[PDB]
Structure formats: C-alpha cells, structure tokens
Symmetry: D2
Subunit: 330 residues, 4 copies
Amino acid sequence: KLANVVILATGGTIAGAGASAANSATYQAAKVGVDKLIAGVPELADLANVRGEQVMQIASESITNDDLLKLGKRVAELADSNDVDGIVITHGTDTLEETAYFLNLVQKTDKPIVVVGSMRPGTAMSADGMLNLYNAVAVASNKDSRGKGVLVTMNDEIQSGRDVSKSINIKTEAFKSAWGPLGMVVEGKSYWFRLPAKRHTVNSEFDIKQISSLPQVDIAYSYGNVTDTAYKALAQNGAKALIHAGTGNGSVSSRVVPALQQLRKNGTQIIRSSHVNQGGFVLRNAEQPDDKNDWVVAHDLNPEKARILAMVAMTKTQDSKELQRIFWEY
Amino acid sequence: KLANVVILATGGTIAGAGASAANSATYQAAKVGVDKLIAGVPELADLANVRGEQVMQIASESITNDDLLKLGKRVAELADSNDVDGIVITHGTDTLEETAYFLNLVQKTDKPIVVVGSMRPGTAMSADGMLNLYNAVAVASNKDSRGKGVLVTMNDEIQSGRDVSKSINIKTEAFKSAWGPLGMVVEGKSYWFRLPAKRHTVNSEFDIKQISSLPQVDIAYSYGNVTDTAYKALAQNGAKALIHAGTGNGSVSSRVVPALQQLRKNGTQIIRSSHVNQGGFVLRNAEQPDDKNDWVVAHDLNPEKARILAMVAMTKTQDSKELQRIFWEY
Amino acid sequence: KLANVVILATGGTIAGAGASAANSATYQAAKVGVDKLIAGVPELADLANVRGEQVMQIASESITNDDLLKLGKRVAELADSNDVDGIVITHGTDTLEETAYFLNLVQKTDKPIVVVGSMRPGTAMSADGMLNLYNAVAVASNKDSRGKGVLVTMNDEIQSGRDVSKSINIKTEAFKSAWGPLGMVVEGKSYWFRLPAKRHTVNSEFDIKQISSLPQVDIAYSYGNVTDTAYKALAQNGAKALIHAGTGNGSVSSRVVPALQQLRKNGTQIIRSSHVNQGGFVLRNAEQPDDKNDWVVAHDLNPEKARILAMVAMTKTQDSKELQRIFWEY
Amino acid sequence: KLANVVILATGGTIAGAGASAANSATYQAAKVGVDKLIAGVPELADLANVRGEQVMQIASESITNDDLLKLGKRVAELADSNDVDGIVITHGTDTLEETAYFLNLVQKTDKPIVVVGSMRPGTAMSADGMLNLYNAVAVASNKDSRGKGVLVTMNDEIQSGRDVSKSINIKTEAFKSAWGPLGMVVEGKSYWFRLPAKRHTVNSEFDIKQISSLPQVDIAYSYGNVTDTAYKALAQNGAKALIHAGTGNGSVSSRVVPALQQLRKNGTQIIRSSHVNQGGFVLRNAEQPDDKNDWVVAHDLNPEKARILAMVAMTKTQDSKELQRIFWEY
Ligand SMILES: *[C@](*)(C=O)CC[C@H](N)C(=O)O
Ligand SMILES: *[C@](*)(C=O)CC[C@H](N)C(=O)O
Ligand SMILES: *[C@](*)(C=O)CC[C@H](N)C(=O)O
Ligand SMILES: *[C@](*)(C=O)CC[C@H](N)C(=O)O
C-alpha cells in the first residue's frame, strides 16, 4: 500500500512569505506551519500517507549546534519506528547543505531521509516549493531510495546530501555538486544514474544516539594580506579545530603558518579546506607539509562541510591520522 | 612592426618546479626566472618584441597590500611609455583573481593588461604554462584587446579580470566566471564573443598614481553556529571594513547582527558578500535591512573580490551610499 | 509613464495544459490564448501598459519557414509604430532558439524584443511561466534593454537571442549559452554584466522587409559509420545549403568528403557545424581544407543556429567567402 | 609485481602531428606509432609493465562498424588472458564516446578498460596527451578500477564510458557527462566519488564473442521546417533503426509523424533522442504517444550514444518493449 512518510518542518523559505506575488527574493522566512504547508499540496495524498510535525520554526542561517542534535535525535526516533517508512525534512536553503551532510553521517538507517527547501517563498508567482515537497515525498516513499544515504530533492534532481551545496544565488538551480546529481525525479518517478561511493548512514562509524554535544569547530577565511588574527581569536574562544578556508589547494600564507603550527602544538586540529569549491580537491602534502606539521586535509569538502565532518569525527577521535582517514572515507 | 610587450614576472606555478615529470600538483612555486620562461617559448618572437622583468618571486597566497601597490605602480609606468603596447603579468593562480581585479580598477589605460598563470609546473608532463604564456602575449599584442579592461588568458579562453575566479582545484580549467568568458585565443588568434558591461581601467574613477596606501579590509566567514568572535577580533585589529562571507544571499545569523550593528556605529564598513560563488548575486534589503543598518551589499562579487573593491573604494569615500554605488558599477 | 508593451503569442508550453497539477512534463501545448495568459499575471499592469495579440497557436517543433516570416513581419510593423515601446513573444521552447536568432538578424530596430517560454505548463504546480512572462514584460519596458539585440528571459536570466540554446531537458534552467547570460532580472529590476559583441538588429545588413521567402536549408548529422545518404537526399530535395553537424571540430568522414565536394560543385553551400555544442568553436581549415574545397565554417553556432544564419545570409549572397565573413560577424 | 597493461592504439590526436609547436588545433591525426607514444612517457614503467599494440591508424570520424568489431574482439582476447590486468585504448576524440560505450556494453569482463585521447597533438606546446596516457595506465593498473565498467581518463578525471561526451571543442576539458565524473586521477593516484548505476560489462546481457555483425542504424536531425526526406532516405538505404535527434524532449514535427508511423509498420525501429544533450532525458509518452505508435525513447542518451545501444540491442531483439527496457537499464 502507501508508504508512511513523516515531514519534519524546520522553517526556511519554503515556509516563508513575501509582500506580494512579485516578491520572489525578498521575504520573511519561517512564517508558515507544517500543516498549512502540507495542505498546499493535495496531490501529496496519492503518493503516501503523510504526517506533519513542526520540529522548529527558524531561518536556517541562525541554526545552532543544539538545533542540529534536536533534529538529528528526532530523526533517529522516527527511523526506529516501524510505522515510519520515509522521512522528509523542510529546511532553509542557507545551511541545508550542512544539515544534510550531518544527518548523512549520524543516522544509522537505510530508510530514506530527504531534505528539501525552496528558493522562492510560497507566496511568490512560480514558487518552486510545492513541486519540491511533492518530489520529496515521492522520493521518500520509494523503496529504491533506501541505502542511498541522505538525499536532497530540488530542481527536479536527486542530489547526495554529502556534497550538494548552495552554489548559485536567487535561481532555483541553486544546489550543485562537483560530482553531479544521483538521478532525477519527474512526475513522481525516480530515475537513478549514479551511486554514492563514500561511507554513509548504515555503514557510518558514527551514531547520533551516542552524541550528547558537538565539539566547537570554526572556520577562518584566507585571502591576500591575510593575518593570523582570526585563527588565534577563534581558538582562544574555545575552537577544538579550525577549518582553514585557503586559496587554491588549501594554501597557507607564509605569515599564517607559524600561528597554525603553534595552534596545532596546543591541541587544536588544523584542517585545510579552500574557497575553490566548484571542483577538484585539496591534496595532502601538496601545498603544505601536512605530515611534518601534523595537519589534516579536507579533500573535496568545502569549509562548511569540512566543519560538520570535523565536529562528528572528533566525538570519536582526537587522532590526526585517523581524522585524515575519516576525511578520505566520508 | 611587431608590437612591444613587457612580461612582468611575479612567481607562481608557471615559474614553479616539481621533483619529476609526473608531478603536476606537488611542487615548489617561484623557482624559475623571467628570461628562462621566455626562453622556453621561442615562438614568442613570432608574435612580438618581448622584454622580461622580474618584479618579485613569490607564491601568490603570501602576497601583501604593498606587493599590490608595487606591481600596480610598475604597470602604470610601463603603460605611459610609448615603447610599450601590451603588458603580460605571470602570477600565481591562488590570488590571481584578486590582483587582476585590482589592476582592472586602478590602471587608467586602454593598453592590454593580461594576467596569466598555470595549474601545472613547467617541469611536469603536459604542463599548461607554455601555451598560456603564448596566448597571453598573443592577446597583449592584439589591437582588438584594447579598451576591454584587464584580461586573464588560461584554458584557451579570454576571461575578464573582474569576475574570473579560481573555482576548480587541480584541473587546467581552474578559472571560471559566472558571466562566461569574453572570448577565446586559438593559434595566436583572438576571438571575441562578449564585451564588459562594468566600469574598468580608462573609465574608472580610481587611479594608482593617486593611491599611496590601501586601508586594511578583512573577511569573516559565516556558517552554522557562527559567533561574532572573528568579526570583532578583525575589527579590533585594524579592519576598516569587514567582508561578511555569508550563507545564501549574504544572510547574517541573528546572533551576529547586533555585533555588526555596533561595529558599524564605530565606523567599520559592513559589506555583505557570500560563499555562494557560482552564480546569482546578493540583493540589497532582501536578507537584511541594509538601509536601516547602513550596510553595503557586494552584488555578485565573491568575498576576496569584494575585499579588493572595498579597499580601493575606501581611498576615495567612507560614505556607505557611495560605496554601494561603486559596488553596483564596478 | 508606463511603457507600451505588446505581447505576440505563438503557442507553446507556456500556453499549454496538463491532466493535473502533478503533470509538469506531460501536457498539451498551445491550449491557452494570449488574453487568458495575460490575465494570469495581474501584476503585469504595474510594469507597463500591455496588449495581447495571438499571432498563431502552435507547438514550436512544428513551426514552418512561413510561420517565421509571418512573425518576423508582424514584429517589424509593431516596431515601426510609435505607440509600441517593447515587444514580448511567447514561444514554445523547442525552437525558441531558432526564432530568437532569426529575429536578432532581421529586425532592424533598437526597441526591446524579448522571446519567452516555459518548461512546465501553467496547470502544473510550481509552473515557471508566470514569472517568466513577468520578467519578459519587465525587461521589454526597460530603456536599458534597448540596443542589446533580441533577448530571452527565463530562469531569472537575460540571455542573448544569438547563442542561447535549449541545452537541458525537463528542468527550468533549460536554456544555456556557451558565453554566459548578459545579466539577470530579479523583482522587476534588470542587472547587466555583459554586452554582445556580434552584429545584430540595428547594425545588421539584413532586413525582414526585403525578405519574401527563405532559401531551403537542411541539416545532416554525422557519427560513426555515417554515409552520404542523408547529404545527397536533402540536396536532391531542393536544399540550397547543407549544415554538416559533424563530430568534434566540424569533422567530415573520409567516405562523406567526396559527396560534399560534388555537392559544392553543383551549387550547394557546405557549412561545417558540429554536435559539440557546450563550448568552443569550429576552426576554418583545421579539420578540413575549407579553402581548397570552398567550404564554410559555422564558427560557434550549433546546427540549428547555423541553418538560420545560412537562410538569411543567402537572401543576400551566394558567395562562400562572404558567407564565411557573415558567420564570423553574426 | 607490477600489473601488465596493454595499450591498444587506434590513431587519433594523441598520435597526431602539427606543423609547429604553436599548432594545437590544426594538425594531422594518426601519424605516430604505438611504441613512439610509449617512448615519450618513460615514467610509464614506474606504473606497470606495458605492451604496445597497433590495431589501426585512423581518424575516429572515419570509423566503421567493422572497426568496432575488430577492436571489440581484440579487447575480448586480451581480457581472457591472465597475462593482461588492464587495457588502455588510445582513440581519436571525435567518436571516442561511441566506442567507449560500445565496449561498455559488449565486453564481459571486470578488468579495467580505459579509453583515452587528447585535444592537442603531441607536437604542440602544452600537449595534453602525455599526462592523459600516464593517467590511463595509472587507472588501468589500479585494482580499484575493476568492476566499474569502461572508463575514459582525460582532464585529470575518471569519466564513465557510458555517458561521457565530447561537449566542448578545442579545450582540454572537451569531455563532459551530465551525471558528473566518477572520480579523478592525480599523480598516479585514483580518487573515487561516484559509482555507476547502469548495467555494464560483467552484468551486461550482451557479449562481443556472440556478435558477428551489427545492424545498420542511422540518425536524422530535427529542427524548424524539417521534412521526412532524410528519414525516408536513410530507411530506403538499409537503416534497421532510425535515431530521431529531436528538438526538446524528443519532439516530432506534425509533418514528420505520419512518415515515422509508416516506417514503423515497415519494421524500422523509431528511437526518440534529442539534441538537448547537457542534461535531463527524453520521457516516454510525453511529447508523443510512444505506446500507440510502438516507438522507443532513448532516455538520457544523446543521438550517437542511442545509435550504439540500438545496434547492440537489435542483435538480440526487435521487440520494441524489450528495446525500451534496454534503454532504461544500460
Ligand atoms: C529564502 C531562500 O530559501 C530564505 C532563505 C533563508 N536565508 C533561510 O531560511 O535559509
Ligand atoms: C600552482 C598553481 O598555480 C602553484 C600555486 C601557488 N600556490 C601560487 O603561487 O599561487
Ligand atoms: C513544453 C515545454 O515547453 C512544451 C514544449 C513543446 N515541444 C513546444 O511547444 O515547444
Ligand atoms: C584531435 C582531437 O582529438 C584530432 C581529432 C580527430 N578528428 C580524430 O581522430 O578524432
């Protein structure tokens, strides 16, 4: 029969509202509740038996680590339930990529977990939210969606929660991945073209049930004439690990290297990422002697993704060699 | 009757060196001299009369504001000479997009200024440097190249120095612009398909000859659970303007808003940019009341690009409304 | 005051209708008339004084050369009128790129000509048509839109009618150009980032007023084991010129070259294009001796674009050297 | 204990030759031998024990169905030998995507089969061939490469032979897949990010050892004002199946429909593909009643790719429903 799908609403633009129908970029996020959001798509009933639950009502750029745990643990409870077949989470696009990757690492279930949002508020003309939610439920109730990890369904695509990222502003095609979408969803039907190769959900060594609180991890941006100011201030404020958002291949300025070395000697993990996020990856020992300095490379993960993985990995290990191995498998 | 082109060497991967021919990503930059580079491309003579000049031998990620002024002034001197028709600058790829944009804003000349680099060291197999240098001189010696602002010539393309960006790591197609290439360079021939719409070089209200010092501008990255720590730290250490690299449409977490407001009252310019750099732009008054807070929006410019424009702009005005106009015109 | 905008409706998906709101890819095109299409966007009134006119009601893949002339001449009449400031044409996406390029070459006016369509029918949920039409009128009533040539406004972008093409199926971001969009349209405001470099509208040597009928031009596809069968059959059926949709750089199979040579000797113009349409261009004399055989290269234009330019150019010249010059300027 | 890799040379640009070092696009293909190619990359020895074999010396645009069978059978023989671990095939870029897909369908083996080419002749500056060949052997000698189907290694990427396509002319980044790269190859090391979802090699129901002849399949291009001329001509000359390269979602002009129906009754398979090859796919029963007319839809495969699948499929069945299943699984 129909699959049982639960919709966990967290707010965002999909639940936002603007001044008029012409307002597709200027609006107030997290204004509409889950039940009114479900009622806007009557054709949802033909896809599955759907239930709405309001986990929170926020603008995603203002999300906290405790908001993540709250959502993560609620997902884990729903997943354990026999009466729940799939899970759809409505999330603001700003940090959707962070939450999607977090869930991918800590939810040890093969049940479909789909995160969805929209680039235009439901009050705008040609609002992308209705179809995105339809596609979300369509994918969550599909048996073929199992064992694929966390999924993001926007712009008629099925993107991997791991490496999808908000790469384009304003437009509905906002979410892209350097390794392409896994498939597409058209008229309730899912079409797969690729499979993930990185560890996730059921085969992850991490488990949200064991996590009580996440370690503080912060990101410093690198550019011309950059100093160590931001790096030291974040570390002094409690950061257990710093994500270096370097130029090119995770490059570090000669006048910032000393700060990073002493920060490492003082127990802070130094993870090299970059602001070159359309493609490619940061190679270990290429731009900097990571072995010599005992640093970690973030591979292909962008700064915000790298932070998420760092937080999670550190609840299990403070070993840099193991942290490096984790950045190469997840 | 061959044009006179001067090559201004600054280091980078083009003048880099790896341990073997199989080393295309692991190597040491700034190892080769200017006339050694010129000697490797004998065919350069066919295109024009080339003169080499070593301005500096550095890795671009370690560039400083003074290095920018030195290069900017050396370029201005060459531009005023009648014995110079076009100017080529070999520069490390890491911060090439920053320098190229700086020159696009402060060089009051219609003579071609082409910045070029390479993703592979000249010691590697299939090194991309030689052809890149050849195309650079080909474009600099071409009369059709005048009046189009600063250009970057890599991957057989003619990119605008304004918005071209290092978006992909490792690959030779590293540089991309959200608005596309202006043209292409094939077998010494230039092909134009697009023209710049933004103010540059000749019609720029800025001039390197009147610029003696650049104000300190820093960048703070925004993400999930971000605090005002780095923002305040950077401001306390001399930052006259802070480039906010926000999530989505330059969004600011509710927790960082009051700090940004206080730093604004204290005279630090708040420029909202984003880490969504593949397309679109940050819209004024959308995600935040820029009018109420007297903040500036970076339009389509990424963080590092917005930093350069801010620096240059602030040498002429500290009026936020004038600053916004400038970000909308350059 | 408000600009006078005329909407010329030709049918297509924007005027289509599906079985239910879930039907975004399966529908019946050309079902809704222009007046009902205008009435679906009440906010259109705030943008300009709009008038609707039904030129035809067809599915664009079934468009004829006489349908093009009909539309082309009707545009020319509206453009000559002082009571018309801008023109918007609703057209099916399938051959939108053909019509947009045709108008770009034959309408000698600086008035804004905007072609628009949608990827989903107005009956679907999250239909992209309403906003596309709004953006179309917004752009057509903008004084800054003048002298830019023919424009296509879809997916919040402003694309050039010359090289925009339907490159992706199903998705709203269907239209792409190898040289990028000219700008974007967000909330009725137009933002420009690039300018066209190719000849168009007011500076075109072609004029629809002089054209009574277009020459027959056809396209043959090239692949592995291709024979001359299609090339000879099309020519024998009246084709004055054949567009060779070759592999790679307009390459021609060794067993197809003879047919092309004799076809040329018999008065048929041979234009080399390719099915490598994401980027780059076909170089003259590279893959085949175009000078020796007196062939023409289509530069960067795809097969269907190349056909449009061929048809138009031939109403003025049957000279191959001049045809080549035209393919290098338009 | 170095793996044994055989390089099967077939010609192309890698073995091409230009007049000078400045000639990167104008040159003559198939000029260099297999052991001359191997001698140019001495470092190849570090990776594995390599044996060279010249199967043919042709320009890929002039490839025939028999050339495919010859290569396909020579590959099968090498695959069954225990003295062969991986197979590298140097092939002209023009029809590389066709051959690579053919081999992906008919080679019943999990041993690595890597097809490689280059955009610049080895005589040119910054020729891309040497590194491309190095990566090819690096990937073929890697145990991780087994069971992933045919791979193409250019531009530092690991592309799937199924959907990789020559999408950009001139540039080294010529090959692109709508579903993204599977991984990357850097400094002799392979990095995987995605796995194939479609049937290939080992789990393919096809086998080159049981294939003696390939049925003739041709392609007709669709556009504005298209007639049934080429469709009928191709069918009258032996075409057992016609690949319709339609506009949009494989749409067919109302004028060409009756002819396609008559050719179907006569036994010619009608496969609807499109010239919208950057993304998306052709949907069954959307633009045309495929069920009523007993036609087949090519899914996401471009024209030349659909031709190869049709050829191979038709050696096993002429049942249209079975043919549709095959297009949905491979
Ligand atoms: C509109 C786009 O989704 C609202 C975005 C907002 N910053 C959010 O909640 O992420
Ligand atoms: C090679 C990439 O171009 C070396 C880059 C280096 N970090 C630089 O000088 O920017
Ligand atoms: C829907 C997409 O626009 C209908 C497309 C149809 N083939 C047309 O009229 O172009
Ligand atoms: C260079 C591009 O690879 C030569 C291509 C030639 N037409 C071929 O052999 O395919």
